[PDB]
Design a protein around this ligand. Sequence first.
Ligand code: ATP
Ligand code: GDP
Lengths: 50, 192, 199, 51, 101, 80, 349
Amino acid sequence: LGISIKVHEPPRKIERFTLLQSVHIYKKHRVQYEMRTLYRCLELEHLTGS
Amino acid sequence: WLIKEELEEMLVEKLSDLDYMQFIRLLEKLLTSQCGAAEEEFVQRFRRSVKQLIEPVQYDEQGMAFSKSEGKRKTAKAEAIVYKHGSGRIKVNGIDYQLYFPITQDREQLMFPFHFVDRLGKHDVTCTVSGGGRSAQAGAIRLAMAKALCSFVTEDEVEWMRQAGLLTTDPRVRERKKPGQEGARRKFTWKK
Amino acid sequence: SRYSPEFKDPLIDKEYYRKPVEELTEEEKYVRELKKTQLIKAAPAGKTSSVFEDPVISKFTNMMMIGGNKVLARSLMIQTLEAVKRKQFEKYHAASAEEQATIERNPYTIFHQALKNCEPMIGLVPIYQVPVPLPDRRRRFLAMKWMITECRDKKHQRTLMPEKLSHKLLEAFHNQGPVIKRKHDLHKMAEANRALAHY
Amino acid sequence: SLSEYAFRMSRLSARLFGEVTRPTNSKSMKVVKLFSELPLAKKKETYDWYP
Amino acid sequence: HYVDWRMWRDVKRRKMAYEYADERLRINSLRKNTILPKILQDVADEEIAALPRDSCPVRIRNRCVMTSRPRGVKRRWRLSRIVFRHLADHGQLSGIQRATW
Amino acid sequence: TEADMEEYIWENSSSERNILETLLQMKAAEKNMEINKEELLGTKEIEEYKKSVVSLKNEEENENSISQYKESVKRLLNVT
Amino acid sequence: RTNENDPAKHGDQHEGQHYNISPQDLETVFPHGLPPRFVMQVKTFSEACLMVRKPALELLHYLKNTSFAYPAIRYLLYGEKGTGKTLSLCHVIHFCAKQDWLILHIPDAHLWVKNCRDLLQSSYNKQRFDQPLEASTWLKNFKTTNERFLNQIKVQEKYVWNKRESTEKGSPLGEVVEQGITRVRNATDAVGIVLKELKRQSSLGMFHLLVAVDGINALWGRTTLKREDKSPIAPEELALVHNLRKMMKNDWHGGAIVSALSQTGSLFKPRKAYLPQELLGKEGFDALDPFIPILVSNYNPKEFESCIQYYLENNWLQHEKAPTEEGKKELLFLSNANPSLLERHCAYL
Ligand SMILES: Nc1ncnc2c1ncn2[C@@H]1O[C@H](COP(=O)(O)OP(=O)(O)OP(=O)(O)O)[C@@H](O)[C@H]1O
Ligand SMILES: Nc1nc2c(ncn2[C@@H]2O[C@H](COP(=O)(O)OP(=O)(O)O)[C@@H](O)[C@H]2O)c(=O)[nH]1
């Protein structure tokens, strides 16, 4: 489409939390879960509204 | 000699440890028997192979000849620029080193690379360091300065610095805390 | 450890790399050639190539360190050395020439000599508290730990660590003081338990 | 307290931006913070917690 | 047909709090200031006390939306730790994965 | 007020009053009452001193600016 | 070494050479103000060899070329931390004292604005405060330094200490100084009186006053002192600080004022800050304007070599490898030719 575009990668984010592994009582033992949000930034420049 | 896994991959079969040892001993006997090239290539079929790259010198607007490198230590990253000719001046983040590093240990760490190759006062250094603490920044600047100075010392001095540890990046970083224990290794007080 | 076993400890010694090739023996040449193919650990932040680097004083400073406060321990050590040197200079200037010749003014020499004098030749371990010989590393560690513990004693009130450590080091340099007494008491106990030492 | 010029200028800026133009302690700014935000019970997470 | 009578009580509390949210907000705003006369603040206090007990938003409890567990509920997913672990372990939850670093 | 003025004005400031008083005392001590207020404030030396003081107060401070201020003060105070 | 005590000999050609303060001069001219590290160095070496540096030479030349008729010119030594501003000021003080000037030396203005638990309300002025201990110590030191002129100077006004005690006009200034020293409770007031007297005597041409204040930025900075109601105290609320502020004004002739900035011991100032404006504050710079700033920097190669040789000749560098060129380069790098860092580093070798 003839649009000036650059690309970069912002640093990823990793959100981690921890939950009790067992059901009743095993506080010493946990499971750690994480969510990874990876980013990609496309910077388009000098393009009209349409 | 290739490991048992490599031999199994080469022969697409499964071999025991004793079979591998027998084959290795036979190959060693072949090598020690003054084998010719026809057998030396056969040996090299089963042979597996076991230096630091140096940045080139650059030139600036002022006309000085310089090299630039970078290093890291813990959570600190530093970039150093060492000029071929200077007077021992080191400026960190635009600040003189004796002011940015009041601790004598950090200044000694900065001195260590130039002192090792006997080049105190023979260069000028500009460093930009970010992250970590005073000692991590000092170590990162030391590593970056050594890597940049490799471009001006002889190859023998480069090897000597590598043997002195001035060029190896310290992989020792903070170990993550694990659940169920106080720290990275400190377990909770074991009750009875 | 984050270092693989392939890594080797660095050898920070300029004289080692300044040795001429001809003086190198066959074994030394082989070692130098092998070192070119070995991974080398990064130089620790403690030791450098400085001509003033004393491993004994560095180890003593590390032992004096409390809670990773290396700056404070180094400050205490340098203050102790300065106090020792100042006391020696005062004694030298206050003494006659005949005594001036004998008076020692190097703080490093005094520190090393005091540590050597405080080294216990033989100690004791349960097997009965059997007297047993001590390796040189254990001897040096015991001397340093005894000096530090004696200086940290609550018997001294309001006196700073550098002054106390300088006083104890000067006492040990003349084979006197509580630490030398502790070493002599340990040796006396070993002599007493010589009978049980056959276990 | 403050220079009268700076005080009047800050009051003019607050009037332009719609902020409180009269002196007010935090206890009464609690009214402003109450009416600026939605009530906790009115948030979609609260009244529509369970399906 | 909620999971338990506790979830039913919480649903009733949430509905009643949403119904009385604006009246509570207005009366509390009358109370939480140092400008209006103290007598008006006292009558506002008795007015807000006259409101039904279950209309107070503090009584709202964030229970798990599938097992009515009162504790161990992640606010983002509104699920108890056990149910969240089950769904994440089966992989039915997008993005969530076992954390290893 | 002084605090309300982010831009430093050299006029009616402590600098002008102090330099005028210093010059007046200097010439009174010299016994040669040859100076005048406008005559002093119009000279090039006073202009350079004002420029250096404005550069220090308003723009930035560094070794070059301090050296320039020192040179201007030395020229004004007749001591070098 | 250039073991010389004559203050009229050393000059630009003596840059890097040594200047000796005799023990009598050390005891009389300097009962205070000398940096504690150099006090220890003097007590150990049994010598008082100050290296002659360019800033000190420039200040000496300015003071030699000045005229007492002119209003008191303000000179301000400044530089990075531990560059030798205090010792340059001390060198100037000693030279002026040998020139038979009257030395009005403040050892440290930071002491008067911090760590004072004996603060009292001023009887002479209920809006101010008095520091009896600091004032008494400074009065003792001032009497020690300027004893020869202490009896000669005549007071110009009658001053009252209590309903029963007063000092008559025309009495020696020694009477007021000894009254302040002995009667500690009035000492602060006496200090101000002395300053006041000195100022007018300087205008009268009785002598050549040299006001020497170290850490001048403490006058217009901030004070950590607190009121009985746990309230902060402005610097001008201290009688000593207000009197020193009055003394700093250039509305008097008959000498010159010399001050030295010192971030060390300052309150509410960043460590790396050394420039005159940053250390002084806007009010301080306005009060001191106009002034001649003199930059004190690290040693040059010649000065560093001279200092190292002076330490070696005194055998201070007891380490075996110190005399070697490698040790000299190591010391130069680890100190960056900074006099304080170099001395502290060499103190444990
Ligand atoms: N001219 C000199 N000759 C010898 N030693 C000097 C000289 N100038 C400074 N020093 C050294 O500097 C140290 C003291 O520094 P000094 O107090 O003079 O400097 P400063 O920057 O004014 O200090 P501070 O910021 O602590 O007030 C001493 O160890 C002293 O030996
Ligand atoms: N006790 C006492 N102190 C005096 C007397 N005269 C002067 N002083 C001291 O000298 C200072 C006088 O300063 P002054 O010239 O009055 O300055 P001013 O207060 O701003 O007008 C005060 O701080 C007093 O402590 C006196 O007669 N008795």
